[PDB]
Amino acid sequence: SRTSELAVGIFVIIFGIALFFLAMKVSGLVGTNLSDGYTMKAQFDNVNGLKPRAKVTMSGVTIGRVDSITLDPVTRLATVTFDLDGKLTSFNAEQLKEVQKNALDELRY
Amino acid sequence: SRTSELAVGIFVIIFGIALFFLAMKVSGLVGTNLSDGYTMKAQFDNVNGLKPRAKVTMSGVTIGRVDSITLDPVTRLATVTFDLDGKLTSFNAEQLKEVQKNALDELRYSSDYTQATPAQQKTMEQQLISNMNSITSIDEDAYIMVATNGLLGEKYLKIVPGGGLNYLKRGDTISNTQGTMDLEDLISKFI
Amino acid sequence: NYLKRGDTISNTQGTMDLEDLISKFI
Amino acid sequence: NYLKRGDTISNTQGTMDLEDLISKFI
Amino acid sequence: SRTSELAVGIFVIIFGIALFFLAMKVSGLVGTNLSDGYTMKAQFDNVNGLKPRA
Amino acid sequence: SRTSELAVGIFVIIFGIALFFLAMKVSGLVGTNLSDGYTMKAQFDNVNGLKPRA
Amino acid sequence: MGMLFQSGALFTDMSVYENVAFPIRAHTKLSENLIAELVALKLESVGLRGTEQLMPTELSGGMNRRVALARAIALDPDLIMYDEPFAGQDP
Amino acid sequence: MNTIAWLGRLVIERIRGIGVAALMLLQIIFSLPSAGGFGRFVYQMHRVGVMSLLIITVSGLFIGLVLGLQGYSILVNVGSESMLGTMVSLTLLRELAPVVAALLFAGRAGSALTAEIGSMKQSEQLASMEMIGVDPLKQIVSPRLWAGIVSLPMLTVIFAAIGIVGGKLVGVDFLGVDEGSFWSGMQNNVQFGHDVVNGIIKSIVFALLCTWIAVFQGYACDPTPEGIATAMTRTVVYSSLCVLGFDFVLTAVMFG
Amino acid sequence: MNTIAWLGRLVIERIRGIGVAALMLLQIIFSLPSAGGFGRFVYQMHRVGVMSLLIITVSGLFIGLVLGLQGYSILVNVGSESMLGTMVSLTLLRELAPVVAALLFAGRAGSALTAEIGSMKQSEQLASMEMIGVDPLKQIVSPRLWAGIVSLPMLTVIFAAIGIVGGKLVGVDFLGVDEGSFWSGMQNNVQFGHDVVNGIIKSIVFALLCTWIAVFQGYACDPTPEGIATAMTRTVVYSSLCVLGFDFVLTAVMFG
């Protein structure tokens, strides 16, 4: 009745603990999330041992991942599609004037 | 009733052996799983340790496997037999139409058409019998070399395209190659 | 100038390793 | 001139990996 | 029905010990020699850490 | 009866193999145990990362 | 038709109240004040009525077949088969 | 040539013996759900799951400590023990949590399931239930199957988590490395959708073969209670040949 | 506070429950040898040893192949796979032949021993033998003990040998390394008196705890054949907590 049903409940708790411990203490699910991650493309020549789902950097710090990579067999060159953050990778509502002030001043100087 | 149990009971074991060959070849131990395969061959002077079943890349993307190593004792040059897959090499119909317009542009140029005789209308005509089949994305001078995969790891055949104006067949011999480089050969020049 | 959501970079640089490095010296 | 909690060290040095060192030498 | 019963025991122990020979073929305790493989020998000065049968 | 002494013999004979396979195909017992050995001793200043049986 | 299993076939996880009520609930839906009512009668018709609380365990083997008799007269069949009622028990 | 016929007639029986057991499996899952089966099922998961929880927790440690002992003794002369957090994790995630937690599950709940159904055939509760028409495949077997498919992947996760924590205990608290380094390398190598979710897909298709072979040998055993005890040791052989044999293939695949 | 008393009186019983079992063990080995016991013993080793030989041979391969698969997949990016012949051997010699061959032996002959004695108490052959005065400890138990102490170290050796040969098969015949560097990288690193003889001392003191706990639960079980089947799954829990627990206490001694 209630004697064993509730002692099933601590078993789901202990499994519930050690799934969180696998998901969000070891597995890279804490570091997979972007926000309006837009996509680019670039044309390489050497991608030796460069797997997909990597972690891209920009200036000493990570920004995001690499989505998928194929060859374009018309010009023999690598094609790399990759997720690019639209937040920390771009700007935000403060910085829009902060680049409007500098794209204007460095053009009309 | 028991003979239907020798009907089903054989079938599960037949389903178990026949699945295991599907789970073998996809991982890949025997029976390469790349589609539409066709074998090419090449010759090296030095393959300083290169196991069968190694990988071939075009600019990084895996495009085939190595079959075996043959040596010829009267000429002492190595010979590597390897297989490719054309789904990402060997142009399709639309990419077939970018090379005939290029052979009419680059090969049949204002100065390049009349390099032998100024009536080279057969130059696109002879090439088209080698273009619906027997056509590689690899150039007529694209040389193959042996790479190193980082700084420590298994060697792999890396193809360098670029340059040239004609193409090979499905099964030719790569006329320009390059052998490996050994650690003693590094310290020889450096010291 | 900068890039739109979806474009290409006009300057790339492929990876290098031991098979390229020693020839990259001289 | 010592520091308090939450202060800023105005002298920092970034990282230089192996690929910067090779191009530095040869 | 000896068409069925002993024929299973015929097939299995044929298939069983033939698999056991595959063990001794890869064991390094049975044979796997060469053929018409001549022998030379050389005289060196330094062999640093060379183990036999390399 | 004789059916028991047989199939317990075949268990020992397989065990006779896999002890010999460990003795003189894996662990060094066939490489060691030289013949007539004396003592030559020397003194160093630094022997870190040096073990017996070297 | 309901039968008797030589050694008595009790489910040693359900209660003795749950043994005899089981063929009713396996057959028909009734309200609980009737389903708990028919068991208190058929348990008296065998003479073991002060139960419905203890398990099939701690029932003496003599009392064991009598509950299995009550499950054999669950609803009210008209064809009960006995596989050796006299197992070799006491006289 | 007569003992040849005895061997021949034995493995002919084992093939048919399988073809019955597949028909019993398709007759269970392709059925409408019984009324109030959930209350039967949760009590069943209290029997198979929650009872086995202790013997896999304290066996989760001793696999972890020996991995935290030989994993240290190997890695010290090579010096590069930034792999201690990675060579505890990648073995425990990829093989020993699918493999060793199966051979301990076939031990306790793999073999206590074939006894409980082996006892129910002999006293003919299962025969008496059929005459009332409750068809005991849906009554006794089917909650004892679905409490085995669900409850094994809920155990290897608890096995792998307490294994990794166990490797950290004798590693950095009794021998000593840089805990930081540990966690770092640990989370900087182990993907989630490639390794953990592949570490559970192996632990589902182990839970099917370890329970369906277990619940079959209880149902299609015989009476005469030397007929129970010959069957409770017929699963534990037949499970462990099919745990490890089905591991290989799967591993090779999900690890070309 | 009553379920506290139920837990308290349960583990009080388990302690006493041990102190009986030690007294039964000292009463066996400190006895004069029975007349013609050797003919009883060799037939017993037929039952426990030779029967279990198949399930450890083909389980010797599948441990070897996965060691020959992950042992290759790890060692390729580091490149230095002169350790493939050493990282197949040193794990299989030190740990997995003492550990995994115990959990497979507790499975088959560890649990079929407690049934055969569990059946003999219930039909009262053991009671009838006492009235003739043949004292069944020396008649039934003692050949069923000495066929378990001798027959387990004769199995881990067969486990470790077919394991190493299995690692060589998928290593150099399907993936490919130097067949010279395998054994020459092996034979040099693996001492005999330090590794193999220490790999058998662990497999003796596993054979004692895995059989004496097994032959006890058959003798001191109860009748009522739900009393056999509760005991055949009381060893396989109690063995595997004491195989792995006594492993880790041992490997810290010889490989500190």
Author numbering:
A (entry chain J): 3 to 111
B (entry chain K): 3 to 193
C (entry chain J), D (entry chain I): 168 to 193
E (entry chain L), F (entry chain G): 3 to 56
G (entry chain E): 92 to 182
H (entry chain D), I (entry chain A): 1 to 256
Show sentences the authors wrote:
The MlaFEDB complex is an ATP-binding cassette transporter to actively translocate the phospholipids between the inner membrane and the periplasmic protein MlaC4,5. The MlaFEDB-mediated glycerophospholipid (PL) transport was reported to play an important role in maintaining the integrity of the lipid membrane. Consistent with the previous reported low-resolution A. baumannii MlaFEDB map8 and our E. coli MlaFEDB map9 (EMD-30355), the MlaF (cytoplasmic nucleotide-binding domain, NBD), MlaE (transmembrane domain), MlaD (periplasmic phospholipid-binding domain), and MlaB (cytoplasmic auxiliary domain) subunits are assembled in a stoichiometry of 2:2:6:2. In summary, we characterize four structures of the A. baumannii MlaFEDB complex in nucleotide-free and vanadate-trapped conformations using single-particle cryo-EM.
To understand the mechanism of glycerophospholipid translocation coupled with the conformational change, distinct conformations of MlaFEDB were trapped using sodium ortho-vanadate. Vanadate acts as a potent inhibitor of ATPase by forming an ADP–vanadate complex that mimics the intermediate state formed during hydrolysis. Three individual conformations were classified and refined to 4.0, 3.6, and 4.0 Å, and were named Vtrans1, Vtrans2, and Vclose, respectively. All three structures display bound nucleotides at the ATP-binding sites. However, the maps are of insufficient quality to distinguish between ADP, ATP, and ADP–vanadate. Comparison of Vtrans1 and Vtrans2 to nucleotide-free structure shows the conformational rearrangement of the MlaD. MlaD hexametric ring rotates clockwise at different levels, whereas MlaFEB remains unchanged. The three vanadate-trapped structures of MlaFEDB reveal different levels of conformational rearrangement of MlaD and MlaE coupled with nucleotide binding and glycerophospholipid translocation.
